[PDB]
Amino acid sequence: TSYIGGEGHNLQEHSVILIRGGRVKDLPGVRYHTVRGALDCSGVKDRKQARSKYGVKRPKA
Amino acid sequence: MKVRASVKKLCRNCKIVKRDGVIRVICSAEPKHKQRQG
Amino acid sequence: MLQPKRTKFRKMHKGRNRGLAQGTDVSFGSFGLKAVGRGRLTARQIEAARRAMTRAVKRQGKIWIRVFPDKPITEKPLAVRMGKGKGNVEYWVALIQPGKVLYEMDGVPEELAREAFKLAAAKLPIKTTFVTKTVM
Amino acid sequence: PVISIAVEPKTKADQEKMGLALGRLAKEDPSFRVWTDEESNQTIIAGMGELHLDIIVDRMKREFNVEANVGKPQVAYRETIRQKVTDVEGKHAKQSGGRGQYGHVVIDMYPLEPGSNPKGYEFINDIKGGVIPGEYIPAVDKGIQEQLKAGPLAGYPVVDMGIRLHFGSYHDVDSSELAFKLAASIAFKEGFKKAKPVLLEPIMKVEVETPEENTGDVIGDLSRRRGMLKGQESEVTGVKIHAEVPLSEMFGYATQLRSLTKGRASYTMEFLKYDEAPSNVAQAVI
Amino acid sequence: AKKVQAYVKLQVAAGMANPSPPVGPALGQQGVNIMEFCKAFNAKTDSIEKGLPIPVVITVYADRSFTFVTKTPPAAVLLKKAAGIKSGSGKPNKDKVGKISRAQLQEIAQTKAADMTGADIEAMTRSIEGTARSMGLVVED
RNA sequence: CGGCGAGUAGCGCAGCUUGGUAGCGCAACUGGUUUGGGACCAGUGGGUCGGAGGUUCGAAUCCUCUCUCGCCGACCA
RNA sequence: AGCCAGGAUGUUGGCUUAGAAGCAGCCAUCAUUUAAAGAAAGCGUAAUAGCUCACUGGUCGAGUCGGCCUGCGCGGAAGA
């Protein structure tokens, strides 16, 4: 198991993700993070700060 | 062709004949009225 | 099925069926179904004759019923040695002398009336006929 | 993009791999669309015509080893209510866990019209006299809303409602953050059966096309499947059949329509509203 | 009019063009164009009334030229217009809808008696009087 | 299909020998005591005896056949 | 009983405004042109139509039709 943060995802029951570690500790043993930005995980909606986290690319305009 | 024990004149082009002791009913208008017994 | 309220005896002797008619007319109306053969009518047949007499005439008009049971034939169940008493009450039957009218029909022309009774006669085990009205 | 197949490949197992390859088949063309259902937990796959739809899965037969079977939508259809009852009671008096747990609520859920706006479901608070204080106004609504999910008419959610409660009693420390919340549910579960409420169906409208005169060919196959034939749109040659047929009698629709019209049709359909279902066809639901 | 091959009795809606639900393919069973029959008949609604259920008698030759014979309203819907009560029977001998005299009904029976097929003018009015007692209505006398 | 055993309120039972008044213990509900549920200390509402009968001074009671639930045997070859 | 013919004009018969227009459902089943032809008889059109009949011409040209009460029979009636 693994936690997803932000707001807004695209998972339906069988999608490819890549899980990284680092627990969240509000659940006793849900022990990872899904690296949002891994092979189907769409870019999270409208992060204008900390775009390294969550993989959102350069507000060009 | 239906067997019965009661033929009944169903169509109006139903005819009654008695070919060889047996009462046949032949509707030339309709195969679904064709019957014999009686 | 039509069956008596508050009889005197539950169980009745066997009896035979000899003789001729009592009610030999059309009396209440004009069109009737008269018994020519002699046989026994059970009550469900009397229900099923009428129940398949309404939709012949599509519930309209009036139909008069002259007859009724109160010959309770009893019948033993399956697997009995003969006699521990009489059988159990199973089903009402109504004896017929030859010549009694059974159903009387009114409010309809004779034209549908001679056509509505042919569906009735095969709901009775006896033979019947159709009698129209007689004066005096 | 109007013909469709589906998947139920042993009902959970093969679906954990195969749908990603549809997206790997979706870069091939932007016409490779799928319809995701979570009413039925299925993905209904489209195609183009006679040539594409069988080699859609036949490429997945040799290169992916899938076990897909063409399926049908089996849905929840809707539910609605019929009449009202203004005497139920939220009578619980549980004791353990702490100080006390008493509740009491009189639950009156009211029938609104089937043709309504999104104000067709509401929590109309009509409390009086301080029999229930105003620090209960979300949780009495929270106890009410929880029974919408597993409403025991074979388990379907239900709409076109409105609740107008009247009467209750509450103690000092007995009535809690939970006491009305269960009282506004299990008692509201008993306000549910006594209306003889109605099962529904997701009404769609028919737009099957016709060359010039083909009404003498379709007059069976849609009239078995609930057709309310409201006419045509008439042109010089192309005229179109227009009726009203809900979703869940498209069981074998797309693969049997060309069996009828000498092999010449292309249907389209669109979903509008909620109408009711009698118990003869509601018998085939449980 | 030629012999009866694609001869129908039609046009449930005169004032509304393309009667698509009831009629629909009733001209379309031959496949005959409705796009020119409307513009021919929009040119012939200039002198007669509109928005009334007026039928048509349409016959085509073997070379796509078609011919209409339009007429007055029929007698069983004349009660809806000459009396002003857009109603029907339900059960006609046991119904009341309205009452109109024959002296009030005859004002259209000047305009239609040239158009119908009869030999006595007061007897083609009797195609409305006996109609009226058969369609739920009574007539004043 | 057939003995013994009964049906008295939501629940379970004396009233039945030898016909005469429908009570009783614990629930729903409310109050006293306490700061409050529970307990104790006391009450209120709850049936006209599954049902149809006849009988009769009046029927749960007296008898008969049915609805239903128990229970007893349903055996030799 | 046939042999060749009309075998309808009016008008979708207001319904049911279902697709119902001789002819899905309730009922009402007027009459005119008339020598005569049910605002419908069997089908049959998705509904028109198509095809036929009643009711009615010319011809052939002598008996012909449906029930009733009855005689003796046919069907119903398959077993090792």
Curated annotation (Swiss-Prot), chain A:
**Which residues are recorded as modified (N6-acetyllysine)?**
K45
Q: Origin, by domain of life?
A: Bacteria
Positions carrying 3-methylthioaspartic acid = D26
Q: Please state which protein family the record places this protein in.
A: Belongs to the universal ribosomal protein uS12 family.
The misc remark on file is: At least 19 substitutions or deletions in 11 codons can promote streptomycin resistance, dependence or pseudodependence; all but one of the streptomycin resistant mutations (K42R) are associated with hyperaccurate translation and thus reduced translational efficiency.
Q: What does this protein do?
A: With S4 and S5 plays an important role in translational accuracy. Interacts with and stabilizes bases of the 16S rRNA that are involved in tRNA selection in the A site and with the mRNA backbone. Located at the interface of the 30S and 50S subunits, it traverses the body of the 30S subunit contacting proteins on the other side and probably holding the rRNA structure together. The combined cluster of proteins S8, S12 and S17 appears to hold together the shoulder and platform of the 30S subunit.
How does this protein assemble? Part of the 30S ribosomal subunit. Contacts proteins S8 and S17. Interacts with ArfA. May interact with IF1 in the 30S initiation complex.
The protein depicted here goes by the name Small ribosomal subunit protein uS12
Shown stretch of the complete protein: 64 to 124 of 124
Swiss-Prot record, chain B:
Listed under subunit, the entry gives: Part of the 50S ribosomal subunit.
GO CC terms, sorted: cytoplasm; cytosolic large ribosomal subunit
Which species is this record about? Answer: Escherichia coli (strain K12)
Q: Keywords of this protein's UniProt record, alphabetized?
A: Ribonucleoprotein, Ribosomal protein, RNA-binding, rRNA-binding
What is the name attached to this protein's record?
Large ribosomal subunit protein bL36A
Instruction: Spell out where the chain crosses the membrane.
Output: none
Q: Name one GO biological process term.
A: translation
InterPro entries linked:
Ribosomal_bL36 (IPR000473), Ribosomal_bL36_sp (IPR035977)
UniProt family annotation = Belongs to the bacterial ribosomal protein bL36 family.
Q: Which terms does the record give in the GO molecular function aspect?
A: rRNA binding; structural constituent of ribosome
The keyword Disulfide bond appears for this protein: no
Cited NCBIfam families: rpmJ_bact
- Which HAMAP family does the record associate with it? Ribosomal_bL36
Q: What does this protein do?
A: One of the last ribosomal proteins to be assembled in the 50S subunit, it contacts a number of helices in the 23S rRNA, acting as molecular glue. The simultaneous presence of uL16 and bL36 probably triggers ObgE's GTPase activity and eventual dissociation from the mature 50S ribosomal subunit.
Swiss-Prot record, chain C:
User: Which domain of life does this protein belong to?
Assistant: Bacteria
Keywords recorded for this protein, A-Z: Hydroxylation, Methylation, Ribonucleoprotein, Ribosomal protein, RNA-binding, rRNA-binding, tRNA-binding
Q: Which Gene3D superfamilies match?
A: Ribosomal protein L10e/L16
- Give GO MF terms, alphabetically: rRNA binding; structural constituent of ribosome; tRNA binding
Biological process (GO), any one: cytoplasmic translation
Establish whether keyword RNA-binding is in the entry: yes
Against SUPFAM superfamilies, the record matches this protein to: Ribosomal protein L16p/L10e
Q: Which Pfam families match?
A: Ribosomal_L16 (PF00252)
Which GO CC terms are listed, alphabetically? cytoplasm; cytosolic large ribosomal subunit
Cited CDD domains: Ribosomal_L16_L10e (cd01433)
Q: Which residues carry this modification: N-methylmethionine?
A: M1
Q: How is the protein modified post-translationally, according to the record?
A: Is hydroxylated on Arg-81 by RoxA. The modification is nearly suppressed when E.coli is grown in anoxia.
(3R)-3-hydroxyarginine PTM positions read R81
Q: Which PROSITE patterns match?
A: RIBOSOMAL_L16_1, RIBOSOMAL_L16_2
Q: Which family does it belong to?
A: Belongs to the universal ribosomal protein uL16 family.
Q: Which PANTHER family match?
A: 50S/60S RIBOSOMAL PROTEIN L16 (PTHR12220), LARGE RIBOSOMAL SUBUNIT PROTEIN UL16M (PTHR12220:SF13)
| Role description | Binds directly to 23S ribosomal RNA and is located at the A site of the peptidyltransferase center. It contacts the A and P site tRNAs. One of the last ribosomal proteins to be assembled in the 50S subunit. The simultaneous presence of uL16 and bL36 probably triggers ObgE's GTPase activity and eventual dissociation from the mature 50S ribosmal subunit. It has an essential role in subunit assembly.
Q: How does it assemble?
A: Part of the 50S ribosomal subunit. Cross-links to the A and P site tRNAs. Interacts with assembly factor DarP(YjgA).
Give the protein's recorded name: Large ribosomal subunit protein uL16
From Swiss-Prot, chain E:
Q: What does this protein do?
A: Forms part of the ribosomal stalk which helps the ribosome interact with GTP-bound translation factors.
Q: Which Gene3D superfamilies match?
A: Ribosomal protein L11, C-terminal domain, Ribosomal protein L11/L12, N-terminal domain
Tell me, which GO biological process terms does this entry list? cytoplasmic translation; ribosomal large subunit assembly; stringent response; translation; translational termination
A Pfam family assignment: Ribosomal_L11
Which GO cellular component terms are attached? cytoplasm; cytosol; cytosolic large ribosomal subunit
Molecular function as annotated in GO: large ribosomal subunit rRNA binding; rRNA binding; structural constituent of ribosome
Which parts of the sequence carry N6-succinyllysine? Answer: K71, K80
- Sequence positions bearing N,N,N-trimethylalanine: A1
Q: Does the keyword NAD apply?
A: no
- Provide the gene name from the record: rplK
Instruction: Please state what the protein is called.
Output: Large ribosomal subunit protein uL11
Name the family the entry cites: Belongs to the universal ribosomal protein uL11 family.
Task: Output the lineage of the source organism.
Answer: Bacteria, Pseudomonadati, Pseudomonadota, Gammaproteobacteria, Enterobacterales
Q: Which UniProt keywords apply?
A: Methylation, Ribonucleoprotein, Ribosomal protein, RNA-binding, rRNA-binding
By its UniProt entry, which SMART domains does this protein fall under? RL11 (SM00649)
Q: Which InterPro entries match?
A: Ribosomal_uL11 (IPR000911), Ribosomal_uL11_bac-typ (IPR006519), Ribosomal_uL11_C (IPR020783), Ribosomal_uL11_C_sf (IPR036769), Ribosomal_uL11_CS (IPR020785), Ribosomal_uL11_N (IPR020784), Ribosomal_uL11_N_sf (IPR036796)
| Keyword field contains Nucleotidyltransferase | no
Tell me which domain of life the UniProt entry assigns to the organism this sequence originates from.
Bacteria
Partners and quaternary state?
Part of the ribosomal stalk of the 50S ribosomal subunit. Interacts with L10 and the large rRNA to form the base of the stalk. L10 forms an elongated spine to which 2 L12 dimers bind in a sequential fashion forming a pentameric L10(L12)2(L12)2 complex.
N6,N6,N6-trimethyllysine carried by residues: K3, K39
